[PDB]
Amino acid sequence: TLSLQLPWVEKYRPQVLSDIVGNKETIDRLQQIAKDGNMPHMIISGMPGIGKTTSVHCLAHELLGRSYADGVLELNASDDRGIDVVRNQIKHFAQKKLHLPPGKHKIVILDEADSMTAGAQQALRRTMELYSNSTRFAFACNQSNKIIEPLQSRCAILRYSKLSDEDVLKRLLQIIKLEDVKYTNDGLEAIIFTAEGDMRQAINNLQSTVAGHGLVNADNVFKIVDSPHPLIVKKMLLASNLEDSIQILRTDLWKKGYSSIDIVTTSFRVTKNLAQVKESVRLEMIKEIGLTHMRILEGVGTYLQLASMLAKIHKLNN
């Protein structure tokens, strides 16, 4: 009862660039670079769980073959990446003499580079510039604005897009066929709808289902995976009448265990990204939501405050 089974996220983690779905142009470009060699400095940006770390790892593995152990230097947020580390260990790795095939180069993979300090990024500039004939740099980040401009200038840009429904669905069919999982169309649609483009969350939900209920359907997925609360908040904020909004808040948000602070924050974000509403009305609703948030942060996290905020928003939009 102590022998853990490898999760499908790691068990079915792609090992070749042909198993990565989405961002077709970038994947083919990476495959062509790996085939032809001469990998340039690159920065890959995108939202979590879309296949950036997997892409860079597969590229490095395919490029370096058996020399992966001695030709790859991987550093992430869980390791010390201070200015001294950049100044000593990275420089030593770049200056290292390693015999490689004619079309290959040493690779430094600085994952989650958005958390690095400014000093390390500044010090890395000439390190990449001088030793570009032996070592190449591949950064993986979630926010591209956290990387200093000089580093972006010295590196190519690869902005990963959001995984389409078709790609996630195809990967789901492939993994289900490999695992021989009994499924229904509605269950897969619900899983993809709840994933919101996050492949990792989709895999986790697909495993939890079948791992807990056997067969995949809408009810089985929904009894363990809840619908994203941002959609419920948007529905509440767009209610035609105050009664409907109050009912939605009471039934789907307050009685389901969601905290008031989370509700007000989600309302703030949704109002921030409501295109259908006019900008001035959105600003007034943002002001009211900020007043409610300030009241909640002071200690009064009561449903009365949320109801009053909804009533004021309805009055403003009338």
């Binding site: 142009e25 083919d28 470009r29 062509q32 670079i33 032809d36 340039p40 400095h41 591209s144 604005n145 401009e149 972006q152 200038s153 010295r154 590196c155 190519a156 840009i157 902005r159 924050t265 703030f268 921030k272 990204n273 295109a275 900008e279 001035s280 959105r282 600003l283 943002i286 002001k287 900020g290 948030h293 300030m294 942060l297």
Partner: protein, 327 residues
């Protein structure tokens, strides 16, 4: 940047500009010919517009795109330009100029520059944007005024929103450290007040003057505290009361008799100083506080130099009591 201040007048300053689209056309065409990929000249400028003067970035872009796409024409220039757009945080002056523009707040502009974009623009520099907005929101010609609304009403609404944002900021930097309210401060301090007076600037953009005023007020408060604690043993009042009530009466005894008796009032002034444990530096600080029609700079300057020299000699030729020891 302030770190470069020491290098102000010790080196020959050489400034490099962003190369024009015509100074690199030949080099880029030569590179395209050498690498055997077609590069349409008519779309070259946009590439620089995409890279914004970065020859290294455009060279890297060409190298990456030529890996699988051997033709660079108008059919795919838009996609690569959108995908390779460089994002650089705007400076406070640029932030103020862009945020106070009425185009982005229109129905058509809002769909291009959204509320999230404005919040990100504020967050590019969150320590200066509210000050610049508060300073430069009175020098615009609004174009988004509501039918029947006047400029003054919009200014008043913006000022009220700025006050609310100031309250929010004070709550943010309290002992609780409620930084999660920073996005709200973006709307109440910069976005909303600018949305009511957005338009075209009526003049040059001026940097916020609140910092210098705050420093001057802090220095004045320090001098007032020094004077108050120097005269504490004699007076029964606080520094506020000393400034509001005592200082004019003191001027009536420490500056007025120099303008009537000439150099014969030195003894009385010295006696007053001894009675209230005042010094010459305290005299200068006190005479520098007055404002309005009671400015003393011109009056002090017009005093004959002989009188001032005699007063200084008399002050330095005798011992004076000290109120506070080892200040």
């Amino acid at each position: 940047l302030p770190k470069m201040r020491p290098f102000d007048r010790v080196c020959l300053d050489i400034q490099f500009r962003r190369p024009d689209a015509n100074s690199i056309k030949s080099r880029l065409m030569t590179i395209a010919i050498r690498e055997k990929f077609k590069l349409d000249p008519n779309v070259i400028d946009r590439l620089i517009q995409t890279t914004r003067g970065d020859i290294r970035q455009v060279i890297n872009l060409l190298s990456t795109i030529s890996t699988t796409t051997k033709t660079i024409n108008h059919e795919n220039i838009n996609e690569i330009s959108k995908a390779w757009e460089k994002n650089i945080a705007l400076k406070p002056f640029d932030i103020a100029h862009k945020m106070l523009d009425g185009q982005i707040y229109s129905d058509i502009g809002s769909r291009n520059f959204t509320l999230n974009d404005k919040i990100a623009l504020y967050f590019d520099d969150f320590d200066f944007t509210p000050l610049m907005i508060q300073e430069n929101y009175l020098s615009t010609r609004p174009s988004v005024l509501k039918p029947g609304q006047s400029h003054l009403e919009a200014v008043a609404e913006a000022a009220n929103c700025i006050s609310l944002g100031d309250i929010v900021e004070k709550k943010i930097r309290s002992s609780e450290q409620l930084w999660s309210l920073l996005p709200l401060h973006a709307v109440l301090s910069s976005v909303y007040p600018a949305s009511k007076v957005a338009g075209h600037m009526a003049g040059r953009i001026n940097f916020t003057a609140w910092l210098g005023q705050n420093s001057k007020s802090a220095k004045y408060y320090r001098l007032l505290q020094e004077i108050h604690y120097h005269t504490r043993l004699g007076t029964s009042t606080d520094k506020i009361g000393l400034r509001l009530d005592y200082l004019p009466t003191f001027r009536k005894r420490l500056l007025d008799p120099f303008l009537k008796q000439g150099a014969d009032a030195i003894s009385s002034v010295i006696e007053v100083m001894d009675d209230y444990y005042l010094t010459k530096e305290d005299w200068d600080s006190i005479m520098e506080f007055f404002v309005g029609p009671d400015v003393t700079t011109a009056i002090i300057k017009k005093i004959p130099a002989t009188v001032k020299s005699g007063f200084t000699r008399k002050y330095n030729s005798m011992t004076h009591p000290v109120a506070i020891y080892r200040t």
